[PDB]
Amino acid sequence: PTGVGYDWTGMSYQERLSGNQAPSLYAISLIVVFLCLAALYESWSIPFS
Amino acid sequence: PNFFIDRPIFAWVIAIIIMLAGGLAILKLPVAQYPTIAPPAVTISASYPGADAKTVQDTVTQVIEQNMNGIDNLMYMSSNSDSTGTVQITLTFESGTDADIAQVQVQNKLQLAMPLLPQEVQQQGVSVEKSSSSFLMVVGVINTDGTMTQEDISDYVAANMKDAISRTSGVGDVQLFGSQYAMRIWMNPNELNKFQLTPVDVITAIKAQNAQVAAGQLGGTPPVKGQQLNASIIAQTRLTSTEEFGKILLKVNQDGSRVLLRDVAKIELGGENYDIIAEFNGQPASGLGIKLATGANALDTAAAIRAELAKMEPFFPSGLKIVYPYDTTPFVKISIHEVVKTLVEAIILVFLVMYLFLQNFRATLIPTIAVPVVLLGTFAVLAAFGFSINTLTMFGMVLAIGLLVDDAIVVVENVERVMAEEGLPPKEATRKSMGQIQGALVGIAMVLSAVFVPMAFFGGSTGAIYRQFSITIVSAMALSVLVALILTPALCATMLKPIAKGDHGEGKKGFFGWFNRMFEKSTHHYTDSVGGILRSTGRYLVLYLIIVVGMAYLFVRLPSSFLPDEDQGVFMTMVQLPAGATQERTQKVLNEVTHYYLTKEKNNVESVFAVNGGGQNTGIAFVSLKDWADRPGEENKVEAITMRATRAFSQIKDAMVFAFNLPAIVELGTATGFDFELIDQAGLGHEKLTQARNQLLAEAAKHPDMLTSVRPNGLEDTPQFKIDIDQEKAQALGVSINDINTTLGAAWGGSYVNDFIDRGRVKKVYVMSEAKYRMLPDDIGDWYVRAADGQMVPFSAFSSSRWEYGSPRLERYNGLPSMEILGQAAPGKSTGEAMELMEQLASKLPTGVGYDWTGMSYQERLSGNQAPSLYAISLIVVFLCLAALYESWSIPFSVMLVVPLGVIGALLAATFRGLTNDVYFQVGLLTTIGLSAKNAILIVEFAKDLMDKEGKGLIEATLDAVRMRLRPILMTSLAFILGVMPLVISTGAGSGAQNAVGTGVMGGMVTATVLAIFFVPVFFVVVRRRFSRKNEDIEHSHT
Amino acid sequence: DIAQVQVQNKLQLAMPLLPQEVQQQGVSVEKSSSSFLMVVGVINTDGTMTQEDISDYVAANMKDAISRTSGVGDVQLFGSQYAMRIWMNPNELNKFQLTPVDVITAIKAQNAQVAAGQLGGTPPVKGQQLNASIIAQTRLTSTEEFGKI
Amino acid sequence: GADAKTVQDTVTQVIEQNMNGIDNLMYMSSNSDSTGTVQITLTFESGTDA
Amino acid sequence: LDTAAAIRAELAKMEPFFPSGLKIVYPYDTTPFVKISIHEVVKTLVEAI
């Protein structure tokens, strides 16, 4: 009924945390690797390739 | 550097990364109006019901000032002992101490003296609190139907909202203003003398019939073997209603009928205490003071608290509505809105200059990219070092905009300048040009951070204040020189368009460049001229000395504020009734004040909070004003508002009432002025010291040419009421003195006796006299004390009564008896001098009359001997760095000599606006100096380069140099002064700052550069004439 | 600091289980030294005063601000502060039919402050004009007034 | 000797209103027993100074 | 050496409100030694230069 909600805590809280962390983490990490290659290698292309 | 010219995209990558660290830093960057600035203060508060000033000073105040030994980093200890029975001891610690550790040490030394306190104090509370007087917001609570009083609303407040406000995001401390529902029994004296009863019986029976009892449990361990049942055994449950307390027994008569509580007194859920009485526009109200969480954003906490109350709005009882007296937040949104507008605006202006001078969209696109970055990164390094977006940090940004604007400009310019001069394709041009300005750039970085780090190391609140700017600006400057060394040269080599040798695009533009000629012509005019002013020198040295001396005179004749007072959307008008006054009179003058603001300020005043604030004797009104867009004019602003209000309450009253606007940062050293503390040190009487204070009243009032407005900061003695109990007569009749005093006490002050439990919240239970039977001294006759053998004795049988004098508010300083004395320096004179004359006057005072400083006068007494040492370090570090950059111990003087030329024009205009030598003015001063020196440096170096690496003469060289350095100096100062312009001519929110910064700066830039482009080569050329014969002249060499 | 406060914390778990003589005579928690950092001496050349007078001056004018210096662990006082000292006469006590108990209880009665009160105290009556302090049983200041006990 | 709904609206709920402005707090959870016990657990941001 | 200097300022401050003839004396203090002892290491370093 109305106003009866849910949560995870302890164990399940921290795992909701790793879920919530997955996408941004491959986002940031993937985008860094990009910069680093475009930087070491003077190319815009090698990063897309 | 040279490196990135060929590695542009490496440059872009670092740019990007600084940007994303920046943008990230910016998305999640805290905001408040000002950063934490005040030394840590913890106040211990406790109340002793019924007590007078000396009772709380001499039973509790002192037991704590004796047990507060060995706590880390004590700065000073200061206590009020109010006749309301409350005692408040303020411990301020060394600036930058762990707030928390301090407080816990304090709370624990307290928890150890706790057994040497009286019993009422122990049960009434001793609290240890961090004392920031800065509440993020005050929400007022009202009822449209006017259904309830204040005590009801108040209890509602304590019962429903503080829970859901304190759960709101960003809300740190939540505080309750008012008295909750407590069980209030108003005794009836005649009704009690009736039945052979005293307050003793009242209290004692009340204790019997209302508590819980050490309960017990069935099947309890260890049970018997094979046991079966185990559950809770309910005992004496605390009483729920008045209706049950009426029926509690006080005395059984012979003929059986019982005498209940209901009989002898009026019984009601009442207020816990009724000293403080509040109206929001005449409608009764209670209030909440919300403090922002630590490391929290102010504006969201505002918006969240607001959505939180708005949802709860429909479940408010009949007619109750939420209102807003106080909110630092909307002003914060608008000041910040205006700083962003500025930074962006200066960017647009730089664009307009760069275009309308270099007239090529790509060139103008570069600096456009440079600053957003330096901005972001700066935002980031400050994010890294953990600052916040406050007035000090953002205006610390504005002040550095000139350095950013200039760093980018110098480079793009010199490059273009090189192509236009020589006809290299863009790259080789940029390499050449970076080649020209590189050594300078690292140099400038070193001289700039040489004037900006020393100001960081200042001490106390002022030093904090400075550290904000110092760091803000070293970061902006740092990132901008690097951007200048890494990206921008690469941006030039890349997106910059080649310009034909000997171009200058002279004329050609029928529609446009009818200007380029004008500027070319005037540029030779210019060279012509400067050579002429090196042709004879003397005049211009005199002229210089003139300017310097003027610089100084003006300097002396300048005012010294701390921070400008700003129209902050709210202010307060505080009220003081004559000594001895009552609630109703004070209250009267308040209703008159309130109605006045609502009358003769109908177009302005939005709302008034009247706080008849215990003690009675004083009252106070917190005042709200409508949004800034509906108070446009000059007479509609706080200046005028407060003036017309003090005009109102000046003559026409029997009570003194002033109306004022607040300092910006709440805990402000009042500029010219001081906090003197006069201390008693010999086992001396309060009498003697008060009379000593009178003496220094006479001695400081006799010196108007130094000191101005010297005052005590407390409430003077008032007459009090002495009731001398003939103990003999009491031991005679057989009455117990414990019973006489404890009954008397219960009668006029009251006694906290029990707790009760209403609706599922535990609340207090007091017992006092009904109003009308404890008011005027004759009421003493109305009360009775029963002996051990059982008979009634009126009080006028065993006591004598009289009037006398006493002090209601007993003050202490660092453990000893003292009297606090505020004061400021004569209209012209300085605080330091005044403080000195105060020492010479107070030196006239008695043995056991010693003196000391605190707070404002403390902070101002120690870290003010730092100014000269820090600018000594600055002069020497800056000098040493330049001595390195040029290869001379002497040439540095040719650039250090410009420093007055900018300073002079700043104070000029600053006096012409009659502003004040404040922080904003001063960091401005530096900034001004700083660019004056950068440009001086670029010119000096260019000259020298010509002399050396080309073997050009000295005079020709200076000419050439200054010539190639004319076009940029102008572009920048042009851009700057033109972006800054709005700071000077802007009102709207908070523009006291905007103007204060802007003025000195703009004036500064005008005289700075207008002087620079003539005095620099003079400075150079003369100073350069204290060096070697052969070489001299010069013009051969060998590359 | 942290240590001091955890230890002081377990000490609060022992505090209501300690007697009142102990509680009111003083329990102290110190992160202090092993030995003496220094010893400050207080004297009088002319010998105008005895020694206990000097001592009183030491706990009355001086000791409080020394134990508050930042960085000072403990102060020890070589001597005692002035306290109102009553030395009973035993035979004199059997004489008048009295014991030390009477002494204590009576001394408690004739010497304290008391929840006094206020004329015009809130809530006053409508149209009230007076609001002032009611002075009560004052604690006794001198030896002589202890004589009359 | 006290009961549960007694300890919670006299001791527990009184404490959770003073736990405002505690830094690096993740979640708050409290038990209120008639065995005489009342118990409050504050779990904090991962890595907070204990 | 610092707690020392602070106790000096507090005491020097307390001197004047003392009664008739009172004087402070110095029986014990580890400090003058610390200062003067490290000071002789200094005289050394310099003369040695």
Ligand SMILES: CCCCCCCCCCCCO[C@@H]1O[C@H](CO)[C@@H](O[C@H]2O[C@H](CO)[C@@H](O)[C@H](O)[C@H]2O)[C@H](O)[C@H]1O
């Ligand atoms: C912002 C763009 C820059 C262009 C602005 C040009 C205006 C210059 C304003 C102030 C500079 C002083 O201007 C200059 O003063 C000196 C006088 O010492 C003149 O110099 C002249 O006078 C003195 C004698 O009086 C002679 O030794 C000198 O040979 C002679 O040519 C300059 O020819 C004159 O132009």
